[PDB]
Design a protein around this ligand. Structure first.
Ligand SMILES: *[C@@H]1O[C@H](CO)[C@@H](O[C@@H]2O[C@H](CO)[C@@H](O)[C@H](O)[C@H]2NC(C)=O)[C@H](O)[C@H]1NC(C)=O
Ligand SMILES: [Ca+2]
Ligand SMILES: [Ca+2]
Lengths: 129, 232, 216, 128, 124, 122
């Protein structure tokens, strides 16, 4: 209740919260706190959509490209309504999987000579077809 | 007698949605025998709107005259001129105006500077700064907002574009807003809306706040696991 | 002073765009009051029910045949007030229409929704109308609360919680994904009254669509 | 209808020391009825029907109505030490997409050590 | 002829334990002839009922002619397994010199040795 | 009524430095009367050329009548700002006691931070 969520990334599992604590009583001596929580996977591979990819042992977390806003907002100017660009900075790699997303693959299946490629489910359960 | 004719900038076109031409006349003696006239390049007349203001301490009168022509004619490059006739002037004055052509378009950058730490110790007021820079041509419109409602114009002052010493053909400008110290310590939010012709969507917006600034502490936490291969 | 019987917005594409035409007693005329802010345009749009005012401007008169006379009173209206009847007007007098310009107003297309692919309606894929195009809604966040809001608007009764076993009978879509991350908390009256991301921005695929089955 | 579960167990540590061969097991349990189809592959290449074996399903003593079976594949010690990948594919009616696959190698599954590197730059960037 | 069977015990999978439901162990016996093998299980020196583990009949090995193999599967509650108990697999064959051989697996089987971790904080 | 002005310096924007072109230093001076002010820019005790900064002009403050204010901005190279060079904004006003007041900032100008890093192994 006393914390405000800024970003809730799922691919990098990054979550940032900010909070002001009323330390002492002088209004000019209150500290501003920034919390970062990162969960890293140790079993996932380089490309989450290809099981043959090698393992990944290097993780990079840029905070300038995480707390960024990229959706035009509406602004009232007393004579019209316009769309405004939040940031000008606006291929990112997905470290972990997303529950709200489904991951599938193509695999050759041989039986009596004939080969039937069928869609698989890399994720354990995720969504249903 | 001095006559100033200012052209309508794109900032006025964006909001008013109407292109009007004004010919300011200063140091005027007899306002009962004056004529503010607007003509085209061939000699055709344009309907004028002359309004006489109040008196002045220096016993002078100011003439304000609006002429309206929609943007299709003006942006095509046609030239206009202003004529002021006076019974004391043997010859009417001629002042021409037109919009320049042939300038490149560079996208401007928006910078918001939080108030200085040494200013809020006086418990008097604060000062937020909205900086727009590196843009061509020299046309810019800046307006401040709070909670979606426009602020009173006096609370802020905006300057004219000035050249950039380190880069030819580029300009910059500033905007300053003054607010109370307790309001800033409470945690209110502010907004700087900037409009320029070279923007992809013609309007840009930034927001500053006390909480989302420079933090004293950085409580970083990292958790390692070999089974959490997915995040909800 | 005359009381406006209605507005018609003639000489424009459809009836949500054009010139402001106040209905004067008997014969009606065009109005070009000064200080025409978006607040009066909002009331004008609400008169017709088109939706939200988006733009208002005065256009140069270049042989536009403005035969319609002009009014002689102002219509200072707060915008949040009711129909043009309930907003103050000046006591007749002269007109503020110095420059001969017509007043323009641009309302928006009204909202609509339907179910496509289900038998006898009340079932199937969700399509929402906006900008004159139908499109699909993403299922990234589709709780049970977001299901009942759509059902009552079309009068299909309370949803019977059909799960996803019978949601494969409608298939995917081909239209643009208009809405995403829809979160409806209360009943409200319409889906647009909820909190969404934006119109045209999504991170979904036509495979992942929303299927709603109400009681019928 | 019950969705089956699949797990792979890597070769034993004291089997590689003899430097003769390695054995990988694919355990599928918790399913009904008792008709399963398990096929092994090596980096997208289907393997021969002769290098792997499979057993008929048998009842589970703990929970009646759910069965289990496993498939055993042998590989050369040098081939497994190189770092090749292997996949286990099972076909059953209970699955949503009706086929699932899982992948194991030397680096994943009872490893020796864990090497991680982390970089956190732009920690004082603009957030707003 | 006769040959010496080899005993391999494999610990439960990490992914199965992450579900916090159950654990399974495997006692693989291979490279032996003829088909006469008798395998039990033990827990802290006392035997368990034969309703909690299952054994399979010998099956010919396709790779090496004249060799057989068999497997036994036992179910263990994840919580018990996480307490730290010990389990034993005993294989009885006529070719072994003493007719009896034993293997033991614990929770700590397979624990890694090094966790090399490095962190960089560049405030650029 | 002569009044002592107040000088405030603004450290450069961090995102401008992140993008690595230059930096913006602002010298905000208000609260002086009458309209007579002269600001200069010096580095390491050596005044810089007049072609290095742009000087604004006096203009009344709408809130408090009778007060004027202006500012000056000097652009610096990113490498020069990173190397640790110092800058200052000396101001001159008749109402000042010694007619000279200075405010100075640097890269190190700020409040000390902390890092409570936690590395959970399981
Ligand atoms: C990661 O894996 C995906 C899936 O194989 C790669 O993208 C696929 O590329 C193939 C052709 O090579 C296409 O047939 C698929 O449609 C692609 N997938 C999607 C979802 O479009 C992707 O290139 C791989 N990334 C890397 C870096 O190798
Ligand atoms: Ca989804
Ligand atoms: Ca979404």
């Amino acid at each position: 209740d006393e914390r405000i969520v800024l970003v809730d990334n799922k691919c990098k599992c990054a979550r940032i919260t900010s909070r002001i604590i009323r330390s002492s009583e002088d209004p000019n001596e209150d500290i501003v706190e920034r919390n970062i929580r990162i969960i890293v996977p140790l079993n996932n591979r380089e490309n989450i959509s290809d099981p043959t990819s090698p393992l990944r042992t290097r993780f990079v977390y840029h905070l300038s490209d995480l707390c960024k806003k990229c959706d035009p907002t509406e602004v009232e100017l007393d004579n019209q309504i316009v769309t405004a660009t939040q940031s000008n900075i606006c291929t990112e790699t997905c470290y972990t999987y997303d529950r709200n997303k489904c991951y599938t693959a193509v695999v050759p299946l041989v039986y009596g000579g004939e080969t039937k490629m069928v869609e698989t489910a890399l994720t354990p359960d995720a969504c249903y077809p | 007698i001095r006559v100033f004719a200012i052209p309508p900038s794109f900032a006025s076109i964006f909001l008013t949605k109407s292109t009007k031409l004004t010919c300011l006349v200063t140091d005027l003696t007899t306002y009962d025998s004056v004529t503010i006239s607007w003509t085209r390049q061939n000699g055709e007349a344009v309907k004028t709107h002359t309004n006489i203001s109040e008196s002045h301490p220096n016993a002078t009168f100011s003439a304000v005259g609006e002429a309206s022509i929609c943007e299709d004619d003006w942006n095509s490059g046609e030239r206009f001129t202003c004529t002021v006739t006076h019974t004391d002037l043997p010859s009417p004055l001629k002042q021409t105006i037109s919009r320049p052509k042939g300038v490149a378009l560079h996208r401007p950058d928006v910078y918001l500077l939080p108030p200085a730490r040494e200013q809020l110790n006086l418990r008097e007021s604060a000062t937020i700064t909205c900086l727009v820079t590196g843009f061509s041509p020299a046309d810019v419109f800046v307006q401040w907002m709070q909670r979606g409602q426009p602020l009173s114009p006096e609370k802020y002052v905006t300057s004219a574009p000035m050249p950039e010493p380190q880069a030819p053909g580029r300009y910059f400008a500033h905007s300053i807003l003054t607010v109370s110290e307790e309001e800033w310590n409470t945690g209110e939010t502010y907004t700087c809306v900037v409009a320029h012709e070279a923007l992809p969507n013609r309007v840009t917006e930034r927001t500053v706040d006390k909480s989302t600034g420079k933090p004293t502490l950085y409580n970083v936490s990292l958790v390692m696991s070999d089974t959490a291969g997915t995040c909800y | 002073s005359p009381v406006p019987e209605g507005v018609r917005l003639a000489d424009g594409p459809g009836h949500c765009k054009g010139r402001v035409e106040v209905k004067h007693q008997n014969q009606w005329y065009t109005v070009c009051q000064t200080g025409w802010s978006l607040r009066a345009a909002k009331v004008v749009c609400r008169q017709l029910g088109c939706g939200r005012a988006v733009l208002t401007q005065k256009r140069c008169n270049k042989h536009a045949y403005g035969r319609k006379p002009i009014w002689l009173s102002q219509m200072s209206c707060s915008g949040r007030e009711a129909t043009l009847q309930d907003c103050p007007s000046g006591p007749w007098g002269k007109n503020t229409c110095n420059h001969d310009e017509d007043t323009w107003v641009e309302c928006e297309d009204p909202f609509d929704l339907r179910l496509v692919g289900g038998d006898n309606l009340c079932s199937g894929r969700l399509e929402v109308l906006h900008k004159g195009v139908w499109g699909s809604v993403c299922d990234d966040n589709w709780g049970e609360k977001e299901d009942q809001v759509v059902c009552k608007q079309l009068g299909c009764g309370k949803s019977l919680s059909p799960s996803f076993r019978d949601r494969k009978c409608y298939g995917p879509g081909v239209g643009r994904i208009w809405l995403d991350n829809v979160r409806c908390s209360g009943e409200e009256q319409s889906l647009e009254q909820c909190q969404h991301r934006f119109w045209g921005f999504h991170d979904c695929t036509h495979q992942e669509d929303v299927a709603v089955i109400c009681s019928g």
